[PDB]
Amino acid sequence: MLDGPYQPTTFTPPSDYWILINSNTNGVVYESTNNSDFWTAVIAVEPHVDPVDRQYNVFGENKQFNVRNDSDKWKFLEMFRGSSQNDFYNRRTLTSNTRLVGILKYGGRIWTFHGETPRATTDSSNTANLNGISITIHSEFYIIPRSQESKCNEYINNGL
């Protein structure tokens, strides 16, 4: 039940579907917010990057983040804030040779994968406004129903 690929766009998915983004370059992979209590932007860092300050345009704001990647695999840094006044901190990191980043709205929370392939695992983030969270996606993506999360886990950890 893997549908796609779909080209980069902005939308608000329904609950109960994994969005699986096939990142093909460094920089911002997606940006997601409800404009109240939830902002997440994922930043892709290519292998073998010494600590360095990099600039990224997220939510129309130029931000500087100090990044690194000591591993041969790509790193996907979740940058989160809970308020517009709050600084974007690296809340989770997905280290992956599969370049598959996932997001699901389910059960009043946002679910994403983090850890290191092929052992990456899901994690939840709370919000008081799940429905209002939209997403801007900068690479091609797929959709798969939550009922097939075992398959989604397989794709995140072992590839398409």
Numbering used by the authors: 3 to 162
Give the article text.
Rotaviruses are the leading etiologic agent of viral gastroenteritis in infants and young children worldwide and are responsible for an estimated 140,000 deaths each year in developing countries. The distal VP8* portion (~27 kDa, N-terminal) of the rotavirus spike protein VP4 from P, P, P and P genotypes recognize the secretor HBGAs. To understand the molecular basis of LNB and H1 recognition and binding to P VP8* we determined the crystal structure of the clinical isolate Pc VP8* in its apo form and bound to LNB and H1 glycans.
The three copies of Pc VP8* in these two crystalline forms present the galectin fold with two twisted β-sheets separated by a superficial cleft that conforms the glycan binding site in P and P genotypes. Furthermore, Pc VP8* are also structurally identical (RMSDs 0.37–0.57 Å) to the VP8* apo forms of the linage I PWa and PRotarix, supporting that the glycan binding site is preformed in the Pc VP8* protein.
